[PDB]
Design a protein around this motif. Structure first.
Motif, PDB file in Angstrom:
ATOM      1  N   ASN A  23      13.131 -27.909  -1.052  1.00  0.00           N
ATOM      2  CA  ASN A  23      13.394 -29.325  -0.829  1.00  0.00           C
ATOM      3  C   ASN A  23      14.840 -29.503  -0.390  1.00  0.00           C
ATOM      4  O   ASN A  23      15.545 -30.388  -0.886  1.00  0.00           O
ATOM      5  CB  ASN A  23      13.110 -30.138  -2.092  1.00  0.00           C
ATOM      6  CG  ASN A  23      13.205 -31.632  -1.860  1.00  0.00           C
ATOM      7  OD1 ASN A  23      14.216 -32.258  -2.175  1.00  0.00           O
ATOM      8  ND2 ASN A  23      12.149 -32.211  -1.302  1.00  0.00           N
ATOM      9  N   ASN A  25      16.687 -31.059   1.378  1.00  0.00           N
ATOM     10  CA  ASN A  25      16.915 -32.312   2.079  1.00  0.00           C
ATOM     11  C   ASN A  25      18.395 -32.675   1.971  1.00  0.00           C
ATOM     12  O   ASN A  25      19.251 -31.822   1.726  1.00  0.00           O
ATOM     13  CB  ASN A  25      15.992 -33.394   1.528  1.00  0.00           C
ATOM     14  CG  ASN A  25      14.542 -33.145   1.874  1.00  0.00           C
ATOM     15  OD1 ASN A  25      13.694 -33.018   0.992  1.00  0.00           O
ATOM     16  ND2 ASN A  25      14.248 -33.070   3.167  1.00  0.00           N
ATOM     17  N   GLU A  26      18.714 -33.952   2.177  1.00  0.00           N
ATOM     18  CA  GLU A  26      20.098 -34.417   2.251  1.00  0.00           C
ATOM     19  C   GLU A  26      20.779 -33.806   3.472  1.00  0.00           C
ATOM     20  O   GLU A  26      21.932 -33.378   3.423  1.00  0.00           O
ATOM     21  CB  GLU A  26      20.878 -34.108   0.967  1.00  0.00           C
ATOM     22  CG  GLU A  26      20.464 -34.942  -0.243  1.00  0.00           C
ATOM     23  CD  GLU A  26      19.310 -34.344  -1.023  1.00  0.00           C
ATOM     24  OE1 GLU A  26      18.837 -33.248  -0.659  1.00  0.00           O
ATOM     25  OE2 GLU A  26      18.878 -34.973  -2.013  1.00  0.00           O
ATOM     26  N   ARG A  82      16.330 -39.533   8.791  1.00  0.00           N
ATOM     27  CA  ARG A  82      16.510 -39.062   7.424  1.00  0.00           C
ATOM     28  C   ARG A  82      17.981 -38.839   7.113  1.00  0.00           C
ATOM     29  O   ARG A  82      18.446 -39.156   6.012  1.00  0.00           O
ATOM     30  CB  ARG A  82      15.719 -37.776   7.203  1.00  0.00           C
ATOM     31  CG  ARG A  82      14.227 -37.947   7.337  1.00  0.00           C
ATOM     32  CD  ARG A  82      13.652 -38.729   6.183  1.00  0.00           C
ATOM     33  NE  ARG A  82      13.778 -38.000   4.931  1.00  0.00           N
ATOM     34  CZ  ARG A  82      12.975 -37.015   4.560  1.00  0.00           C
ATOM     35  NH1 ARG A  82      11.988 -36.599   5.337  1.00  0.00           N
ATOM     36  NH2 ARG A  82      13.166 -36.431   3.382  1.00  0.00           N
TER      37      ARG A  82
ATOM     38  N   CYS B  31       5.940 -34.959  -3.344  1.00  0.00           N
ATOM     39  CA  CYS B  31       6.970 -35.729  -2.659  1.00  0.00           C
ATOM     40  C   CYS B  31       7.906 -34.818  -1.879  1.00  0.00           C
ATOM     41  O   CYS B  31       8.246 -33.720  -2.325  1.00  0.00           O
ATOM     42  CB  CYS B  31       7.776 -36.549  -3.663  1.00  0.00           C
ATOM     43  SG  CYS B  31       6.871 -37.897  -4.428  1.00  0.00           S
ATOM     44  N   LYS B  32       8.334 -35.290  -0.709  1.00  0.00           N
ATOM     45  CA  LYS B  32       9.321 -34.601   0.123  1.00  0.00           C
ATOM     46  C   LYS B  32      10.404 -35.611   0.490  1.00  0.00           C
ATOM     47  O   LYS B  32      10.345 -36.249   1.544  1.00  0.00           O
ATOM     48  CB  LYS B  32       8.666 -33.992   1.358  1.00  0.00           C
ATOM     49  CG  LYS B  32       7.766 -34.945   2.127  1.00  0.00           C
ATOM     50  CD  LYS B  32       6.995 -34.219   3.221  1.00  0.00           C
ATOM     51  CE  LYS B  32       7.904 -33.747   4.350  1.00  0.00           C
ATOM     52  NZ  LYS B  32       8.530 -34.882   5.083  1.00  0.00           N
ATOM     53  N   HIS B  33      11.397 -35.749  -0.383  1.00  0.00           N
ATOM     54  CA  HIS B  33      12.488 -36.693  -0.178  1.00  0.00           C
ATOM     55  C   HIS B  33      13.489 -36.512  -1.307  1.00  0.00           C
ATOM     56  O   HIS B  33      13.187 -35.903  -2.336  1.00  0.00           O
ATOM     57  CB  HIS B  33      11.986 -38.135  -0.138  1.00  0.00           C
ATOM     58  CG  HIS B  33      11.227 -38.537  -1.360  1.00  0.00           C
ATOM     59  ND1 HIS B  33      11.806 -38.598  -2.609  1.00  0.00           N
ATOM     60  CD2 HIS B  33       9.931 -38.884  -1.528  1.00  0.00           C
ATOM     61  CE1 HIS B  33      10.899 -38.973  -3.493  1.00  0.00           C
ATOM     62  NE2 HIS B  33       9.753 -39.151  -2.864  1.00  0.00           N
ATOM     63  N   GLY B  34      14.680 -37.065  -1.109  1.00  0.00           N
ATOM     64  CA  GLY B  34      15.730 -36.961  -2.101  1.00  0.00           C
ATOM     65  C   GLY B  34      15.348 -37.600  -3.418  1.00  0.00           C
ATOM     66  O   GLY B  34      14.202 -38.018  -3.604  1.00  0.00           O
TER      67      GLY B  34
END
Ligand SMILES: Nc1ncnc2c1ncn2[C@@H]1O[C@H](COP(=O)(O)OP(=O)(O)OP(=O)(O)O)[C@@H](O)[C@H]1O
Ligand SMILES: Nc1ncnc2c1ncn2[C@@H]1O[C@H](COP(=O)(O)OP(=O)(O)O)[C@@H](O)[C@H]1O
Ligand SMILES: [Zn+2]
Ligand SMILES: [Zn+2]
Lengths: 561, 474
Positions: A23, A25-26, A82, B31-34
């Motif tokens: 994950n 992300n960011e 994003r 979930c795929k998000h911060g």
């Protein structure tokens, strides 16, 4: 610290572990390159309304609500959205088009309403509707009742939120035409951002970003790869890196055993990517962005066009002064010219000249080749004339270069183009250039005032122009020391630039043939004059005499008028 | 009205409407998000989520949550409309005054005042969720009536409503006492004059309201002992056979229509009375477990315009015919076949009533939790209308019941022997006491912190006269 984070401390501030490992992300502003202008526009539209709302309240205006964002697939639209959402550090509700359009009847609208209501509740909010073209497609294509219901629900929510709200909606779509037109009015997705293929610097930045963890070998020339990669969007560059890594693995497979479950770490220590792997990946790459019209970026100056000084200065006066000096035009109240049409023998350097003109005013460039125009005429193409001009407006300033315009201008497409040109904003600096070889055949309706009224003749290169073209074409090709090209230039009277390039191609082909023969027998680092002599002996003008006579007669007749 | 209607209803409805009922959810593994930001699986679950219910074994959606669903589905704020009222009760009576140019119904009818076809379909919101009995004695004595006599019984039940956490925005009806009207019970059934019963119940209801109670349903016993040596009863009511015959459903619908639930979100201000009906028949075993039911809103509005009547088949309700002053359109009851497809079957001859019911869940309070019982009673003074049995309220019964404690003291014992429903009603019928005297009597008997109030009662002259006459009477 960084990324809204507040050796261990450095890692925590970004200055089971699987959950975050997969994950990752960011993806901040440091994970994007080559889209500085679009990123700046998005930041202006997003951060300011949310970060510092007091500015707009002090002035007393309502900042934009919807922000449409479209471009070719694989250019990082979703990644850019994003990144903006994460950097702004504000609540944001994902909505994936196909996901919403993949639920039982009477539930897609429920998900949309829940998304909008929840984003409203936790203001500031950023609602990212991805693949919006899959939930609000063009009216005619999707006559299904459920699609109409979802479109109406989305329209109702969009209209009903614009009231003292800090909610900003960001949408992503492949083309501006796929979305239903009803979603492009006031109080809706009004401000739009177009994303085009990156230039050489953009591709270099993308390679830098992607090739940061790979264990590259010291013998890498990423600048060369960036220069060679043309028309590659970021996704294709990621694919290139993956293919290079796979090629390295395949090369190293000899020292490894497939059956063995474990792999020695010592072998892994020797997994170094090489330039040959990248060249092989280029060999196996399949770029597809150019298959449809896209806003490019050109960097040609007044050095790749030889001679034609009068034409160069005329183009400067026609194009640069308006864009560069609008104050004088406003003072004299003169509307700048809205287009120009090039006519002359093919291969005289019309496309290069147009690209140079586009580069001069530091504006984007759009190319519409003749086959695309014919495809649109038959109505079996994704894009459309209206789409081309809408993208040109969005990415203004721009130069739209219609090519092989004779084929369409021997009807529907001509009338549509005329309507688009008439409807264009005069003040906005967007110019339309035309390329053709049959000026008589071109429909006279196009050449009316307020249209491609300017006519420019592109003659065959002269002795100095031929010499300059020869010098330019041989910049990247090694040549024997003390080799003169004046003899070739004088001997090539009446030849066009394409013929000169063909002669160079033939000479280099003979040289490479000789090198291959010598290597096979077992020496040829230079090109001797014999190659050029033989190539010229095996070369001929590509322009018929009668066509040249008629072109000069037409030019004289036009001058008389 | 330019906005929400203005009207006052129970406190339970108000407090329920205050809340939101959103069921929070945590980061799903999908979930795929911060950390911040929620996609489609981390969003709060609405209180009316059908999947959550059927996954938790809840069959209906706790009406208040249904109101939340309807308000969310429409009524955008600040614009888009002028508040079209969301709830409206069905009405099948033909408009006698339409007059597009036609005359009244008996001799003329257009296509605008013609009752369209009625589509029966099982309801999804149950107004009252959990019926709760404060003490098992309340129903144990009721069954004891049949035990002694053998004939069936029937009685209204008094109580009040409250919240019910176990179901999203759910309600429970807590029943405190049972009152028995004068009925001519028999072996296979019972009979009671409606006029006299309602006349008596009017004043009984006035007194109960004075006590703080309210009429919240009717409970009757359908019990027939088996031949087993010990106590066993046949289970005539289960999935195979009917749950409530047509006549019982008709009576329940009448009662519901006669106790409207005042609400703020309807054109008329009322909707779907909170009036649970309970029945005792015995589960598959020999037990005497009870049940509960409540007729759906259509059946509530389907029987106001007649249109239904009992049938010899227990589980099917016969349909009447057209005539002046009564227009009955075609009735379609819509079920779902085993292949998951909705099927509409015309049922003019007769249709099952299971499409005209919603089920509740009975229960008793935990036997080790807080006891807020108003009455520590139901074992003492004979109940009201048990003339057939040896039970008979009278002066000598009061002398035998509450003379020894009254003449001596034991204020704890006096209070526990004074907080009985039927005893209070009987002494009220005695009229020996003055209005405010009876008010302080009830406030001492049906309240905590009752020391000074009971002391005031005993110090009064009325109580002295009452005890004097009790002593005089044998
Ligand atoms: N600056 C960049 N521009 C484009 N792609 C980039 C860039 N930096 C990295 N990439 C990589 O390029 C790929 C872009 O894929 P992405 O899903 O963002 O494209 P998209 O076409 O906008 O997506 P969507 O399917 O939502 O329309 C990803 O691998 C991303 O990691
Ligand atoms: N000044 C010049 N005159 C003619 N040809 C040139 C000149 N400069 C470069 N060229 C070469 O001529 C070619 C022009 O190709 P293109 O633009 O497709 O055809 P056309 O010139 O008919 O538009 C290019 O490949 C380029 O290398
Ligand atoms: Zn999520
Ligand atoms: Zn009528």
């Amino acid at each position: 610290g960084k990324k809204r984070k507040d050796r261990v401390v450095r890692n925590n501030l970004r200055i089971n572990r699987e959950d975050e490992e997969n994950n990752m992300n960011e993806v901040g502003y440091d994970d994007i390159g080559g889209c500085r202008k679009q990123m700046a526009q998005i930041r202006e539209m997003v951060e300011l309304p949310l970060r510092h709302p007091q500015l707009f309240k002090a002035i007393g205006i309502k900042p934009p609500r919807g922000v449409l964002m479209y471009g070719p697939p694989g250019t990082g639209k979703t990644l850019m959205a994003r990144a903006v959402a994460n950097e702004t550090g504000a609540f944001f509700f994902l909505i994936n088009g196909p996901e919403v359009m993949s639920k039982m009847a009477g539930e897609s609208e429920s998900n949309l309403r829940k998304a909008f209501e929840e984003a409203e509740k936790n203001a500031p909010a950023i609602i990212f509707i991805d693949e919006i073209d899959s939930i609000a497609p063009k009216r005619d294509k999707t006559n299904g009742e459920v699609e109409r219901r979802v479109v109406s629900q989305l329209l109702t929510l969009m209209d009903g939120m614009k009231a003292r709200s800090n909610v900003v909606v960001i949408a992503a779509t492949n083309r501006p035409n796929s979305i239903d037109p009803a979603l492009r009015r006031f109080g809706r997705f009004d401000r739009e951002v177009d994303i085009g293929i990156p230039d050489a610097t953009g591709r270099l930045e993308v390679l830098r970003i992607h090739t940061k963890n790979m264990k590259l070998a010291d013998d890498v020339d990423l600048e060369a790869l960036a220069a060679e990669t043309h028309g590659y969007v970021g996704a294709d560059i990621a694919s290139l890196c993956s293919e290079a890594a796979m090629q390295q693995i395949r090369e190293k497979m000899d020292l490894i055993d497939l059956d063995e479950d474990e792999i020695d770490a010592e072998v892994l220590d020797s997994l170094g990517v090489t330039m040959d792997n990248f060249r092989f990946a280029l060999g196996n790459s399949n770029p597809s962005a150019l298959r449809e019209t896209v806003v490019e970026s050109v960097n040609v100056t007044w050095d790749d066009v030889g001679g034609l000084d009068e034409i160069k200065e005329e183009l400067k006066e026609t194009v640069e002064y308006p864009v560069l000096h609008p104050d004088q035009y406003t003072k004299f109240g003169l509307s700048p010219s809205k287009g120009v049409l090039f006519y002359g023998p093919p291969g005289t350097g019309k496309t290069l000249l147009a690209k140079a003109v586009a580069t001069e005013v530091s504006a984007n460039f759009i190319s519409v080749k003749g086959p695309e125009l014919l495809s649109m005429w038959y109505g079996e193409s994704e894009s459309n004339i209206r789409d081309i001009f809408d993208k040109a407006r969005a990415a203004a300033p721009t130069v739209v270069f219609l090519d092989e315009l004779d084929s369409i201008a021997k009807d529907r497409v001509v009338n549509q183009l005329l309507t688009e040109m008439d409807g264009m904003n005069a003040k906005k600096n967007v110019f339309v250039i035309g390329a053709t070889n049959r000026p008589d055949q071109i429909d006279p309706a196009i050449l009316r005032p307020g249209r491609l009224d300017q006519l420019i003749y592109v003659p065959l290169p002269d002795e100095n122009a031929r010499l300059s073209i020869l010098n330019a074409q041989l910049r990247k090709t090694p040549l024997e020391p003390g080799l003169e090209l004046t003899a070739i230039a004088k001997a090539t009277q009446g030849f066009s630039g394409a013929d000169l390039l063909y002669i160079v191609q033939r000479a280099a082909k003979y040289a490479i043939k000789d090198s291959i023969e010598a290597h096979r027998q077992h020496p040829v680092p230079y090109i001797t004059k014999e190659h050029f002599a033989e190539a010229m002996k095996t070369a001929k003008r590509s322009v018929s005499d009668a066509e040249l006579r008629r072109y000069e007669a037409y030019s004289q007749q036009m001058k008389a008028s | 009205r330019y906005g929400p209607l203005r009207i006052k209803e129970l406190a339970v409805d108000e407090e329920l409407e205050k809340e939101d009922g959103l069921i929070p959810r945590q980061k799903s593994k999908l979930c795929k998000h911060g950390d911040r930001g929620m996609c489609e699986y981390c969003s709060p679950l609405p209180p009316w989520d059908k999947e959550y219910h059927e996954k938790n074994k809840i069959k209906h959606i706790s009406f208040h949550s249904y109101l939340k669903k309807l308000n969310e589905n429409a009524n955008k704020k600040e614009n888009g409309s002028s508040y079209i009222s969301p709830l409206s009760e069905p009405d099948f009576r033909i408009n006698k005054r339409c007059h597009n140019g036609h005359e009244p119904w008996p001799r003329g009818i257009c296509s605008k005042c013609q009752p369209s076809a009625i589509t029966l379909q099982q309801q999804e919101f149950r107004m009252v969720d959990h019926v709760e009995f404060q003490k098992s004695e309340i129903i144990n004595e009721f069954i004891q009536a049949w035990r002694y006599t053998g004939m069936q019984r029937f009685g209204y039940m008094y109580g009040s409503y409250s919240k019910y956490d176990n179901t999203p925005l759910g309600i429970k009806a807590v029943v405190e006492a049972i009152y028995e009207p004068p009925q001519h019970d028999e072996q296979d059934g019972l009979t009671m004059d409606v006029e006299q019963v309602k006349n008596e119940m009017l004043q009984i209801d006035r007194q109960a309201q004075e006590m703080g109670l309210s009429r919240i349903g009717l409970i009757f016993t359908d019990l027939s002992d088996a031949g087993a040596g010990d106590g066993s009863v046949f289970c005539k009511r289960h999935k195979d056979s009917f749950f409530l015959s047509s006549l019982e459903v008709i009576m329940a619908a009448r009662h519901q229509t006669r106790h409207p639930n005042v609400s703020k979100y309807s054109e008329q201000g009322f909707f779907s009375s909170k009036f649970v009906t309970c029945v005792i028949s015995g589960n598959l075993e020999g037990e005497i477990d009870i049940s509960s039911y409540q007729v759906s809103t259509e059946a509530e509005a389907l029987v106001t315009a007649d249109m239904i009547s009992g049938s010899t088949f227990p589980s099917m309700a016969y349909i009447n015919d057209t005539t002046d002053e009564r227009y009955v359109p075609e009735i379609f009851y819509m079920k779902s076949n085993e292949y998951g497809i909705t099927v509409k079957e015309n049922a003019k001859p007769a249709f099952p009533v299971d499409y005209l019911l919603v089920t509740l869940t009975h229960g008793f309070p935990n036997t080790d939790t807080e006891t807020n019982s108003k009455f520590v009673s139901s074992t003492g003074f004979p109940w009201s209308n048990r003339q057939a049995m040896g039970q008979s309220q009278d002066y000598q019964e009061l002398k035998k019941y509450l003379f020894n404690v009254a003449s001596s003291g034991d204020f704890n014992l006096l209070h526990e022997k004074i907080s009985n429903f039927h005893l209070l009603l009987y002494i009220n019928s005695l009229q020996i006491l003055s209005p405010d005297e009876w008010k302080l009597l009830i406030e001492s008997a049906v309240k905590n912190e009752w020391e000074e109030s009971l002391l005031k009662l005993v110090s009064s002259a009325g109580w002295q006269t009452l005890v004097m006459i009790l002593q005089e009477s044998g």
